[PDB]
């Protein structure tokens, strides 16, 4: 669950923005790219 | 999954009934009635009175009949 | 030998940057020009 | 009331020409899985900081009256049930209470208020934890108080503390209270699967009962069947602790499997009921007594959340009650059981049919009826009801009793993400993990009529 | 359990009675010390970190000294005998819905404005007699009442066989009607139960109840199907849980008042009251009066507790020790 | 396993073991050198036994 | 048995023919190991001619 983006500008608080970056730490999905394992073998 | 069995039974105090199972033996034909019939939460109501195998070569015959009556109620 | 994103690697730090499109509520307003009826 | 088997679901272990349609067909002679999602997404979500247990204050009420332990004569002997009157001629006697709640010079009253008022003649002589007052009558009582109204369990309230007009001395005191608090726990879910878009071992083939008798998407199935783990630990969770707090079920690492309760275990601790037959005599009295003491007269709208066959069980139960209303004669001009529809077959053509969904009890108790479709589950509910169904659609539930200005029931969640995932290659195992919980704040604000064939 | 005080109340656990102040060697001993003129009585007791003394009771300034036995504080649990109403019908009339409403009055509250109602239901049959109906009413009551997944147990359901008439048979939600085989049942005993208890935080209370009946039609008349009287109680809750709460309060006039608040940085007073033993209580209430103008009484008290076993040997030893030392006339129980 | 408490990561496409854990390993290869021990003198109490 | 059950499941609740359904799979908060599995279905073909 990436946190809710349907919010007023006041309810996008400092903890709400911090919760967005913490979702990036828990990790790509793309269906027109190859995998990272594939492109590193090519490199 | 060997033979077919038509049963006549008696739900106790509620009415009469007809059933038909597929089981190996009539001990398992009574098992599937008491465990998969509609009286599954009150399975002591089933009183099976007659189990008889569906043998074919007549190919035309009655197997079960049980009329509830205005005087039995 | 041997017979994962750390915070550090060879003294360097780990910088992870997230860019995302969030949903902003805005108003569309229909007003009239005072000079001409537009 | 009889079925006929239209399908059989058998596993694979007991088992190109052109196609007509490419997308598969789901027959009507095939049951389907029933998600508890829109039952669980009807509740809000309260977000929490971490995995610690949490507590909240429970603020109660104040207006007490104290039970009696015994009553004694002036010579010290206790009163009996067959005794005579106590305190004739305003003679003093003793009165034993388990707490010191009243003061000197106060008037206390029995179960018969204001007929036999008892004036306390001094401070409580303490006896252990009990409190022994010397009392006399405050109502011009020449005959005394009978021994029937001076037994154990009689409630005693405070009235006032009357003094004399000239040279009065101090009487009466004031009393204080304090609140309580309650807790709730968490539960941790895991799934695995050894795999990629192709099937695995656990296969069930569906055979239809007719007269002439692709490639599997794994990452949609392991997302959905783990969501149903998360839905079942929400709704059908059970607590495995003592009243000491030690867990009973230990996992594979030696640490105890910490598991919290569900919705249907928390909500069924208060106002729950197992009935052998459904009747409106029970339902209109079970709903009145809760609303006689806990609700106002305008705030008595009870919405029954139930199943589908329970709605026709409520339909045929209301219809028998209106069948007993011999004073009112129901006409088609008012109820419109028979309506007129325009048809090609006739100029004056009709329609027929009706269904009761509401019942309005005395003093403003109204009953609605909405049907929640996950009550009719063929997988989860296996005990069958003789009127047709799964005997769980015949279960009635009242969520949201009254107005609380706050959600009574919600789903717990950890801030950020409580979901974890993993892929283990060599054996290609996919792992998922999630922690969750559900909190019912006031379980006395939910009423349930469950069938008696689903207990014990 | 918080109690009210005239003024301050101290409790001393008398675990053993010695004869001199030097033999106080284990936690809980006591010696009632006095003078040879009988003008000051105090209790030296071995607290778990050394010898402590009580206040000095001037024997001229006592008000009362009474001792209360263990059965005088033990709470009797009330029972209710539910029968069929004899004037309405001595037999169950066929086809009627028999509903019994249990009306709880102090549930999850301190007040009579927190009520709770548990029901039981039996529909009657054509050949259902009075003894079969009492069997069916108890199963349907205990299935609602004593589920395992409740908040707290509320009441206990018991039947009485007419052949026995003094031994009750228990029925729970786990009891099937094949177990109850007696053919002469005459009443349904509903008995309130002992609520949970932790010392200091949750004091000992009980939830009272009265059963109420819904009306049935026997001859076209809406009549209440039964009557419910309260019989004399048979079960009594022992006195252990009241005193362990009483010591937890009264060890804060002597000890610390912050009984564990800022949790690692606290003081723990050792409590010598065992909640699995019944106790007798001796109350000595007295006062202090100053020199010339400070003639106000400061009415304090000293509580003595001792464990008893049947005939109260330890308390009557303690009363016998004070009566020869102080010279009072405390009654021997 | 499924998460690293050390590096703060939830999600593992290449898992090590099935257990919910993390193990940190360190290793080092180290040495000293005294080229001339006749440029260095010691004087030890003999209760230390060398 | 799991849900705080201390007096045991009755013998009448374990007979032949009693259907059993999957609810969920719990583990601990600390050092968990793998549980649970995922189920599938295959289709059967109907048939017609000209
Ligand atoms: Mg509830």
């Amino acid at each position: 669950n990436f946190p809710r983006q349907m919010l007023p500008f006041s309810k996008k608080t400092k903890q709400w923005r911090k919760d967005c970056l913490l979702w990036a730490n828990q990790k790509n999905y793309s269906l027109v790219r190859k995998s990272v394992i594939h492109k590193k073998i090519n490199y | 999954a060997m033979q077919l069995w038509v049963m006549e039974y008696e739900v106790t105090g509620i009415g009469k009934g007809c059933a038909m199972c597929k089981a190996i033996n009539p001990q398992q034909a009574e098992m599937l009635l008491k465990s998969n019939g509609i009286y599954n939460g009150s399975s002591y109501l089933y009183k099976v009175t007659r189990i008889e195998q569906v043998i074919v070569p007549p190919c035309n015959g009655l197997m079960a009949e049980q009329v509830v009556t205005y005087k039995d109620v | 030998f041997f017979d994962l994103l750390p915070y550090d690697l060879a003294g360097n730090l780990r910088v992870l940057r997230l860019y995302w499109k969030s949903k902003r509520k805005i108003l569309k307003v229909k007003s009239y020009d005072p000079e001409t009826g537009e | 009331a009889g079925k006929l088997g239209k399908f059989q679901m058998l596993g694979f272990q007991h088992w190109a020409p052109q196609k007509a349609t490419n997308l598969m067909v789901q027959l009507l002679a095939f049951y389907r899985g029933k998600s508890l999602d829109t039952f669980l997404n009807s509740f809000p979500t309260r977000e929490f900081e971490d995995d610690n247990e949490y507590y909240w204050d429970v603020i109660g009420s104040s207006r007490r009256n104290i039970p009696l332990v015994e009553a004694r004569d002036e010579n010290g002997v206790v009163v009996a049930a067959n005794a005579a009157n106590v305190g004739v001629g305003t003679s003093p006697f003793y009165l034993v209470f388990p707490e010191d709640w009243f003061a000197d010079g106060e008037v206390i009253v029995g179960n018969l208020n204001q007929v036999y008022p008892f004036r306390i003649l001094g401070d409580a002589r303490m006896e252990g934890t009990n409190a022994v007052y010397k009392v006399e009558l405050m109502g011009g009582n020449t005959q005394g108080v009978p021994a029937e109204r001076l037994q154990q369990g009689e409630r005693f309230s405070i009235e006032f503390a009357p003094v004399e007009k000239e040279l009065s001395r101090k009487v009466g005191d004031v009393r204080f209270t304090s609140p309580v608090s309650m807790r709730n726990e968490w539960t941790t879910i895991r799934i695995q699967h050894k795999v990629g878009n192709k099937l695995n071992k656990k296969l069930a083939m569906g055979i239809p009962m007719v007269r002439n008798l692709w490639m599997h998407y794994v990452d949609w199935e392991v997302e959905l069947q783990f969501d149903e783990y998360k839905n079942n630990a929400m709704a059908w969770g059970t607590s495995n602790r003592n009243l000491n707090g030690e867990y009973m079920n230990f996992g594979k690492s030696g640490n105890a499997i910490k598991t919290g309760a569900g919705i249907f275990e928390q909500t069924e601790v208060a106002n729950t009921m197992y009935y052998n037959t459904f009747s409106l005599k029970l339902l209109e009295d079970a709903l009145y007594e809760l609303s006689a003491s806990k609700l106002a007269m305008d705030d008595r709208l009870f919405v029954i959340k139930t199943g589908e066959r329970g709605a026709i069980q409520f339909h045929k139960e209301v219809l028998k009650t209106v069948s007993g209303w011999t004073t009112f004669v129901l006409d088609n001009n008012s109820t419109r059981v028979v309506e007129k529809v325009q048809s090609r077959l006739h100029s004056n053509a009709l329609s027929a049919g009706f269904q009761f969904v509401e019942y309005k009890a005395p003093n403003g108790v109204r009953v609605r009826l909405d049907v929640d479709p996950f009550y009719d589950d063929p997988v989860r509910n296996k005990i069958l009801h003789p009127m047709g169904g799964v005997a769980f659609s015949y279960r009635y539930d009242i969520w949201y009793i009254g107005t609380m200005d706050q959600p009574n029931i919600f789903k717990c969640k950890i801030k950020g993400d409580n979901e974890y995932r993993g892929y283990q290659w060599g054996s290609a195992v996919i792992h998922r993990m999630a922690t969750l919980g559900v909190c019912v704040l006031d379980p006395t604000r939910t009423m349930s009529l469950i069938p008696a064939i689903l207990q014990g | 359990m918080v109690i009210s005080i005239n003024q301050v109340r101290q409790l001393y656990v008398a675990k053993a009675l010695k004869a001199n102040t030097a033999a106080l060697t284990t936690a809980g001993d006591i010696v009632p010390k006095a003078d040879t003129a009988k003008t000051t009585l105090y209790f030296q007791s071995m607290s778990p970190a050394g010898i402590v003394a009580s206040d000095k009771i001037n024997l001229k300034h006592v008000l009362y000294a009474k001792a209360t036995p263990s059965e005088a504080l033990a709470h009797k649990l009330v029972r209710y005998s539910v029968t069929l109403d004899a004037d309405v019908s001595a037999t169950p009339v066929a086809g009627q819905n028999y509903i019994l409403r249990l009306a709880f009055r102090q549930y999850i509250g301190l007040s009579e404005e927190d009520q709770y109602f548990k029901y039981g239901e039996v529909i009657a049959r054509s050949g259902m007699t009075a003894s079969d109906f009492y069997k069916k009413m108890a199963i349907s009551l205990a299935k609602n009442l004593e589920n395992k997944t409740e908040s707290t147990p509320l009441v206990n359901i018991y039947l009485i066989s007419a052949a026995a008439a003094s031994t009750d048979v228990p029925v729970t939600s786990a009891t099937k009607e094949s177990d109850l085989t007696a053919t002469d049942y005459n009443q349904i005993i509903i008995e309130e139960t002992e609520q949970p208890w932790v010392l200091g935080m949750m004091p000992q209370a009980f939830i009272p109840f009265t059963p109420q009946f819904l009306t049935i039609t026997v001859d076209g008349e809406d009549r209440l199907w039964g009557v419910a009287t309260v019989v004399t109680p048979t079960k009594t809750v022992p006195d252990g849980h009241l005193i362990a709460d009483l010591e937890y309060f009264c060890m804060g006039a002597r000890g610390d008042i912050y009984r564990g608040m800022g949790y690692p940085n606290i003081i723990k007073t050792t409590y010598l009251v065992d909640p699995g033993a019944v106790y007798d209580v001796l109350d000595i209430h007295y006062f202090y009066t100053g020199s010339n103008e400070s003639v106000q009484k400061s009415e304090k008290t000293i509580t003595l507790v001792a464990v008893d076993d049947g005939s109260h040997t330890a308390m009557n030893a303690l009363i016998g020790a004070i009566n020869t030392a102080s010279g009072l006339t405390i009654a021997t129980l | 396993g499924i998460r690293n408490p050390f590096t703060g990561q939830k999600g593992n496409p290449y898992m090590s073991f099935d257990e919910d854990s993390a193990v940190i390993h360190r290793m080092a290869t180290l040495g000293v050198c005294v080229l001339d021990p006749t440029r260095t003198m010691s004087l030890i109490p003999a209760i230390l036994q060398g």
Side-chain angles (χ1 to χ4, degrees), chain A, chain B, chain C, chain D, chain E, chain F:
Chain A
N1 47 285
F2 185 68
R4 271 188 65 246
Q5 309 307 284
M6 205 189 180
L7 287 177
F9 76 101
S10 63
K11 272 165 61 78
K12 294 182 171 166
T13 184
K14 189 259 185 183
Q15 188 52 49
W16 176 88
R17 303 151 164 188
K18 193 175 138 175
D19 287 12
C20 297
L21 288 175
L22 260 49
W23 182 90
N25 212 14
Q26 67 100 38
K27 65 167 276 303
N28 183 44
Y29 278 26
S30 200
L31 31 79
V32 294
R33 307 180 75 205
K34 303 265 192 155
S35 63
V36 167
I37 299 100
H38 196 90
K39 309 177 219 139
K40 203 186 177 182
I41 292 169
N42 280 0
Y43 271 131
Chain B
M2 211 82 61
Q3 313 286 306
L4 309 182
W5 306 87
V6 184
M7 294 177 308
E8 292 279 35
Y9 61 96
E10 177 45 43
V11 297
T12 302
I14 306 197
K16 301 175 185 179
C18 302
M20 194 199 302
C21 300
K22 182 163 185 169
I24 316 184
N25 44 358
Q27 194 269 327
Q28 204 191 12
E30 280 155 292
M31 183 271 275
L32 308 174
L33 168 75
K34 299 177 177 52
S35 176
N36 306 330
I38 52 168
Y39 288 86
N40 218 356
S42 315
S43 172
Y44 60 96
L45 288 186
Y46 285 123
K47 285 311 305 171
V48 182
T49 73
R50 181 179 64 188
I51 314 161
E52 55 90 19
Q53 199 185 315
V54 194
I55 210 162
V56 59
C59 290
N60 190 26
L62 258 171
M63 285 180 304
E65 53 184 0
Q66 224 165 6
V67 191
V68 308
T69 315
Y70 282 119
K71 303 319 159 215
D72 303 348
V73 71
Chain C
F1 292 147
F2 298 108
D3 282 86
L4 276 173
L5 285 186
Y7 300 144
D8 263 24
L9 201 44
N12 294 323
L13 272 79
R14 200 210 54 203
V15 176
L16 193 145
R17 283 173 310 190
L18 169 64
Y19 298 88
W20 80 92
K21 275 178 208 185
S22 90
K23 298 179 185 179
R24 160 150 71 144
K25 177 184 207 157
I26 57 157
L27 310 171
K28 173 142 92 152
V29 187
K30 180 175 73 61
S31 64
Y32 308 93
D33 182 36
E35 269 83 19
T36 175
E38 213 186 29
Chain D
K3 278 200 304 311
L4 205 151
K6 296 280 171 60
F7 62 96
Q8 194 179 9
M9 293 261 191
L10 307 164
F12 186 83
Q13 278 84 237
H14 308 297
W15 271 103
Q18 55 176 356
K19 256 62 191 160
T21 182
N22 265 333
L23 73 161
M24 263 170 266
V25 186
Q26 274 191 344
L27 306 196
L28 272 187
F30 272 135
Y31 75 95
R32 295 150 179 86
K34 287 183 181 291
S35 294
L36 299 91
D37 54 354
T38 192
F39 166 63
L40 267 300
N41 298 347
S42 56
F43 298 135
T45 289
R46 171 68 69 185
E47 206 174 15
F48 284 84
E49 57 181 2
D50 215 330
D51 64 328
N52 302 132
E53 285 173 70
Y54 47 93
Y55 53 89
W56 56 97
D57 321 293
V58 181
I59 315 284
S61 158
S62 280
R63 286 208 147 279
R64 300 188 70 205
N65 44 43
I66 318 295
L68 192 62
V69 161
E70 48 197 315
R72 305 172 174 180
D73 194 18
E74 54 162 16
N75 283 118
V77 68
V78 72
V79 74
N82 43 307
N85 283 13
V86 197
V88 297
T90 54
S91 68
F93 63 98
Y94 296 90
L95 204 64
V96 178
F97 287 88
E99 291 155 2
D100 195 335
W101 190 254
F102 325 114
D104 51 344
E106 269 191 353
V107 167
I108 54 179
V109 287
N111 282 340
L112 269 298
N113 305 292
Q114 69 103 21
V115 175
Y116 307 104
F118 310 103
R119 186 203 149 207
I120 304 155
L121 315 178
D123 266 320
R125 282 167 163 242
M126 296 297 289
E127 285 198 10
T129 43
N130 292 354
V132 183
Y133 309 90
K134 192 176 64 171
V135 300
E136 66 177 9
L137 296 165
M138 205 60 205
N141 283 53
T142 44
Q143 66 269 6
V145 50
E148 316 143 11
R149 302 284 101 188
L150 272 192
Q151 295 286 145
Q152 179 181 357
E154 193 191 15
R155 307 193 255 153
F156 280 86
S157 200
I158 314 163
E159 282 216 346
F160 51 91
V163 298
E164 61 266 23
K165 327 176 84 171
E166 290 194 320
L167 296 170
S168 64
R169 285 177 68 86
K170 58 170 180 75
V171 294
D173 277 270
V174 305
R175 297 135 195 99
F176 303 88
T177 54
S178 85
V180 294
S181 87
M182 208 168 71
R183 315 173 70 98
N184 190 255
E185 311 148 32
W186 298 87
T187 170
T188 302
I189 306 302
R190 203 161 165 162
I191 210 173
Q192 68 95 32
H193 191 206
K194 194 179 296 182
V195 191
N197 310 132
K198 197 39 176 158
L199 82 177
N200 297 76
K201 185 181 179 291
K202 281 193 203 339
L203 200 64
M205 165 182 158
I207 296 169
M209 294 295 107
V210 307
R211 196 190 192 98
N212 47 336
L213 175 146
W214 284 18
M215 289 218 315
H216 300 226
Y217 198 14
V218 163
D219 269 340
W220 200 77
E221 283 294 324
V222 195
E223 282 276 273
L224 183 53
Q225 280 198 241
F226 189 58
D227 189 5
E228 301 155 8
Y229 279 16
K230 296 196 287 187
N231 294 346
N232 290 326
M234 276 161 175
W236 314 106
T238 55
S239 180
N240 51 340
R241 300 182 77 177
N242 306 110
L243 300 191
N244 198 17
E246 323 160 26
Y247 295 89
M248 287 202 225
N249 296 255
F250 298 89
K252 302 176 174 188
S253 303
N255 314 332
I257 296 192
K258 299 190 192 292
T259 292
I263 310 183
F264 292 92
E265 202 274 297
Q266 281 165 61
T267 45
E268 282 179 21
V269 310
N271 292 301
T272 185
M273 177 173 328
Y274 291 95
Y275 62 95
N276 313 97
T277 189
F278 174 51
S279 48
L280 282 173
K281 176 216 199 194
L282 173 63
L283 200 55
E284 80 181 359
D285 203 35
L287 260 63
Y288 180 67
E289 300 275 352
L290 185 144
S291 45
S293 89
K294 297 176 178 171
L295 282 175
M297 261 179 170
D298 50 67
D299 187 29
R300 274 173 191 183
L301 274 295
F302 291 118
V303 178
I304 308 293
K305 302 251 174 188
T306 180
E308 212 185 8
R309 321 268 189 154
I312 69 171
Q313 200 199 46
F314 187 80
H315 157 65
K316 297 204 299 175
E317 195 40 78
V318 171
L319 179 57
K320 195 173 76 71
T321 298
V322 194
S323 283
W325 292 351
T326 166
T327 80
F328 306 112
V329 49
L330 277 79
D331 50 1
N332 198 46
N333 212 324
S334 303
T335 81
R336 289 210 175 275
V337 62
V338 175
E339 310 206 78
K340 317 204 282 310
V341 300
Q342 167 255 341
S343 200
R344 184 190 46 117
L345 307 178
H346 212 277
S347 66
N348 172 62
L350 302 160
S351 159
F354 77 119
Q355 179 167 356
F356 286 108
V357 304
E358 300 273 323
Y359 185 71
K360 304 201 263 280
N363 285 350
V365 173
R366 304 164 57 176
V367 175
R368 293 199 58 240
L369 195 53
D370 302 280
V371 166
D372 219 25
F374 91 105
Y375 279 70
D376 276 288
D377 213 5
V379 274
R380 195 81 31 199
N381 300 113
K382 307 145 264 272
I383 281 177
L384 305 179
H385 201 250
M387 306 282 171
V390 300
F392 192 72
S393 63
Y394 297 84
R395 154 171 202 186
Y396 306 115
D397 285 319
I398 300 105
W399 322 89
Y400 310 135
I401 289 185
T403 165
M404 210 185 138
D405 294 325
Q406 211 56 42
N408 191 18
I409 302 167
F410 45 83
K411 320 185 289 282
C412 291
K413 202 166 63 73
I414 288 180
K415 169 164 289 268
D417 280 87
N418 57 21
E419 273 82 25
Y420 305 91
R421 207 181 315 260
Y423 292 70
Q424 173 187 339
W425 323 100
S427 177
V429 193
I430 55 187
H431 296 279
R432 301 224 45 205
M433 201 190 293
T435 188
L436 56 92
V438 56
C439 177
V440 182
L441 296 188
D442 213 344
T444 53
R445 304 182 78 123
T446 172
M447 180 156 273
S448 62
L449 261 77
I450 318 167
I453 72 182
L454 312 172
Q455 206 271 338
Chain E
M1 170 213 57
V2 195
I3 46 157
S4 199
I5 52 172
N6 199 347
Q7 259 146 358
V8 80
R9 172 181 208 172
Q10 311 297 330
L11 181 132
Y12 287 90
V13 180
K15 269 172 72 179
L17 207 167
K18 266 81 173 150
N20 50 25
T21 187
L24 295 150
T25 173
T26 202
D29 312 313
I30 206 162
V31 275
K33 298 296 294 299
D35 294 28
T36 77
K38 311 217 173 56
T39 174
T40 295
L41 166 79
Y42 54 97
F43 294 92
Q44 304 184 14
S45 181
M46 182 75 181
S47 185
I51 299 104
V52 301
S54 46
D55 321 317
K56 276 80 185 171
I57 304 170
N58 195 357
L59 275 305
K60 196 219 287 166
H61 287 158
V62 291
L63 305 163
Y64 61 93
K66 292 184 287 184
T68 77
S70 156
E71 71 187 21
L73 279 157
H75 188 254
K76 295 176 179 181
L77 293 181
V78 307
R79 312 157 72 94
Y80 266 95
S81 176
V82 170
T83 46
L84 285 161
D85 214 354
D87 40 8
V88 175
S89 278
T91 187
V93 291
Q96 274 304 312
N97 195 15
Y98 279 68
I99 298 174
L100 175 133
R101 167 184 38 222
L102 284 163
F104 302 109
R105 278 183 277 104
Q106 263 152 24
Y107 179 71
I108 211 0
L110 226 40
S111 47
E112 274 74 359
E113 286 161 351
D114 272 299
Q115 271 169 337
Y116 183 53
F117 301 94
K118 287 297 261 192
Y119 294 88
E121 182 184 2
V122 161
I123 208 164
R125 218 63 41 82
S126 198
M128 184 177 286
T129 182
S131 42
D132 289 331
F133 164 68
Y134 291 148
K135 170 188 316 162
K136 294 296 293 295
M137 197 85 220
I139 305 283
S140 177
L141 265 167
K143 276 194 315 176
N144 296 321
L145 265 50
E146 200 54 51
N147 279 325
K148 196 263 180 184
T149 174
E150 81 285 31
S151 88
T152 64
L154 275 178
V155 277
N156 291 143
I157 302 300
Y158 305 120
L159 304 164
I160 297 285
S161 279
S166 87
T167 66
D168 65 319
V169 302
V171 47
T172 43
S173 43
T175 287
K176 263 213 292 182
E177 40 185 330
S178 158
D179 311 299
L180 309 152
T181 43
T183 76
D184 43 359
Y185 288 135
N186 39 288
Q187 50 201 310
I188 303 160
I189 298 305
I190 315 180
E191 180 197 57
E192 78 182 25
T193 197
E194 324 175 0
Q195 289 302 304
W197 171 91
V198 62
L199 77 164
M201 300 192 284
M202 183 193 300
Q204 176 185 284
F206 302 95
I207 299 189
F209 72 104
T210 72
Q212 299 174 323
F213 315 102
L214 284 174
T215 48
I216 57 159
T217 62
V218 287
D219 204 78
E221 306 158 316
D222 290 12
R223 312 268 299 274
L224 303 105
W225 63 267
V227 75
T229 41
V230 45
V231 305
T232 171
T234 297
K235 169 56 58 152
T236 170
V237 185
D239 207 14
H241 294 308
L242 278 165
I243 305 300
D245 266 324
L246 186 69
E247 196 203 21
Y248 195 90
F249 179 75
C250 297
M251 284 281 278
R254 279 183 288 162
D256 59 332
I257 48 155
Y258 324 105
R259 304 168 177 87
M261 264 310 277
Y263 179 67
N265 319 319
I266 62 171
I267 304 301
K268 280 223 161 82
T269 58
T270 316
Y271 305 110
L272 298 168
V273 166
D274 193 352
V278 307
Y279 284 100
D280 311 330
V281 178
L282 168 78
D283 287 333
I284 316 175
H285 189 58
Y286 63 104
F287 58 95
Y288 169 79
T289 304
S291 62
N292 315 324
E293 78 272 357
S294 315
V295 291
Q296 281 84 21
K297 311 174 186 304
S298 307
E299 290 182 351
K300 66 188 83 69
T301 189
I302 290 181
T303 310
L304 274 304
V305 75
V307 56
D308 60 318
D309 34 16
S311 82
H312 321 267
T313 42
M315 190 37 91
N316 281 106
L318 189 53
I319 295 173
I322 296 155
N323 275 133
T324 75
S326 87
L328 285 167
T329 324
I330 307 176
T332 59
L333 50 84
Chain F
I2 215 157
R3 48 189 157 170
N4 214 337
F6 296 107
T7 60
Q9 204 149 2
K10 308 139 90 178
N12 207 356
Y14 202 75
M15 195 178 278
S16 312
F17 43 85
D18 46 39
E19 215 171 26
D20 166 79
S21 288
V23 189
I24 180 174
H25 300 99
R26 304 284 310 276
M27 274 261 291
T29 295
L30 67 157
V32 295
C33 188
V34 176
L35 296 171
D36 200 344
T38 73
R39 292 285 179 141
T40 304
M41 188 171 148
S42 40
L43 180 54
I44 310 174
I47 79 174
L48 290 166
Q49 212 153 26

